[PDB]
């Protein structure tokens, strides 16, 4: 190819274009779902004060 | 509570005269000082994120060619600079019953007084740099140019001062003057003793002192622009931009806790337990001057200027000093204090060994001189990051 900011050619990798062509923010495609209590699902609820 | 404390208002001495036939507001207090830079610099939209200013720079070019000569290739270029806001803030405290009473309208009056102090702090940070937060880029006194106006302003501004701008290829668009300048405009006379800036029989106030223009350029007046020995400025005020992320944002509590001491050594007081109300104030200004060299400092009579010369990391080669554009012979980064003095007085014009002064060790010089001083460090073969700045009047 050519140097990281070559003297005669414009390229996307050139230092001249930092702050443009930034990668787009996505959602987390690998969001592990929150755990939740099993004890509060099996055990009998009573009122409290 | 902690009665008559320096840090809270509690029926201290001030309110000894209250709720009786006190003589209204007084007849002698001056109006609150307006901001100045906020009426001459363009306001630019500022987010809490700060902003990026892009700038073109590439020296793109074309060549003359004969028939059948193969055509040349070229590349443009761009660069960017960031600007950030900085906060300014204060707190004031009073007994809750003092807030109910509001003696001499103090809790109202205080909101005006802090607003003035916060405005003044911005102008001091822009003009003279006195306490400026690290995020502010440049201040007006940091300019490498100065002019005297004493005998008459016309020669000072329109001839000499303008020459010191246009010789640098920088233009003059506004001038900013302190009220203390009025005697040298009133005293600006022709050889017959007629004033220049006012017309016959002399009823009218002198032209620039009505915010009239001088030689096409608007005049901006102020009561507080002067500091040290500088009485005003002339330059391209389009080179300044400022912003404000949000308003003065008064907030209040009867319930928080304050440290009346320091982070290093606390002295906590509960606002609830001592029954005090506190007000919290903040504003979030930002500033950039594109080039501090675009301004002439105005001085009420002639002065010397003094510069800090910084060769930190310089390790090979030589540097070149220049006075009013006349280059010295080159100097080694390791040279003596007296070597630098002998070199600057070896510039071919006007200088002398009795008026010029040089102080400090090798590579860390301080230069005091009757002129604009500039440096070329490109003869340093290793150890870039060298610099020069003004530091005071001489």
């Amino acid at each position: 190819g050519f140097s990281a900011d070559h003297s005669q050619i414009a390229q996307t990798k050139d230092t001249m274009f930092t702050g443009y062509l930034d990668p787009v923010q996505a959602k987390d495609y690998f969001a592990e779902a929150e755990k939740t209590s099993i004890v509060q699902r099996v055990a009998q609820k009573i009122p409290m004060g | 509570s902690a009665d008559h404390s320096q840090i809270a208002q509690t029926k201290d001495t001030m309110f000894t005269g209250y709720l009786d036939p006190v003589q209204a507001k007084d007849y002698f207090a001056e109006a609150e000082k307006t901001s100045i830079v906020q009426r001459v610099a363009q306001k630019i939209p500022m987010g809490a994120t700060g902003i990026v200013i892009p700038h073109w720079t590439g020296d793109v070019s074309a060549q003359w060619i004969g028939e059948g000569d193969m055509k040349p290739i070229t590349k443009g270029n761009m660069t960017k600079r960031d600007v950030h806001p900085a906060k300014i803030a204060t707190i004031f405290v009073a007994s809750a019953e003092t807030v109910r009473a509001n003696p001499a309208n103090y809790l109202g009056t205080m909101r005006t007084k802090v607003a003035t102090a916060i405005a003044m702090a911005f102008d001091n940070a822009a003009l003279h740099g006195t306490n400026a937060p690290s995020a502010f880029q440049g201040y007006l006194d940091q300019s490498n140019k100065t002019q005297s106006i004493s005998p008459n302003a016309y020669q000072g501004l329109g001839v000499s001062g303008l020459t010191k701008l246009v010789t640098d290829g920088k233009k003059w668009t506004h001038t900013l003057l302190d009220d203390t300048v009025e005697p040298v405009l009133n005293g600006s006379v022709d050889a017959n003793g007629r004033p220049l800036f006012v017309e016959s029989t002399y009823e009218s106030l002198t032209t620039p002192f009505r915010e009239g223009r001088i030689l096409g350029r608007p005049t901006i007046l102020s009561d507080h622009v002067a500091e040290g020995d500088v009485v005003g400025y002339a330059g391209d005020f389009s080179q300044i931009i400022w912003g404000q992320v949000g308003g003065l944002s008064f907030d209040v509590t009867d319930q928080a806790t304050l440290n009346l001491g320091s982070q290093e050594s606390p002295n906590f007081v509960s606002l609830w337990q001592h029954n005090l109300v506190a007000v919290r104030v903040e504003a979030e200004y930002g500033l950039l001057i594109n080039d501090v060299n675009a301004f002439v400092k105005l001085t009420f009579d002639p002065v010397l200027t003094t510069y800090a010369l910084d060769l930190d990391g310089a390790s090979a080669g030589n540097f070149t000093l220049s006075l009013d554009g006349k280059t010295s012979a080159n100097i080694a980064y390791n040279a003596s204090t007296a070597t630098v003095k002998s070199a600057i007085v070896a510039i071919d014009d006007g200088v002398s060994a009795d008026d010029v002064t040089v102080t400090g060790s090798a590579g860390d010089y301080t230069i005091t001189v009757p002129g604009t001083l500039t440096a070329d460090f490109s003869g340093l073969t290793d150890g870039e990051g060298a610099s020069i700045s003004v530091v005071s009047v001489g």
């Binding site: 009998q44 609820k45 009573i46 009122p47 | -």
Partner: protein, 44 residues
């Protein structure tokens, strides 16, 4: 959906605790021995 034999027991335990509030109101409309009514000067 919800399990109706769970709802049976769940609501039955909700009801059976609730009755204890109601006894404190019954004890005014018909005169039970309220503990706070006892005149303290009367000997034991």
């Amino acid at each position: 959906s919800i399990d109706p034999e769970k709802l049976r027991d769940q609501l039955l335990d909700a009801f059976e605790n609730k009755q204890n509030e109601l006894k404190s109101s019954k004890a005014y409309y018909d005169a039970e021995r309220r503990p706070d009514a006892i005149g303290l000067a009367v000997p034991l």
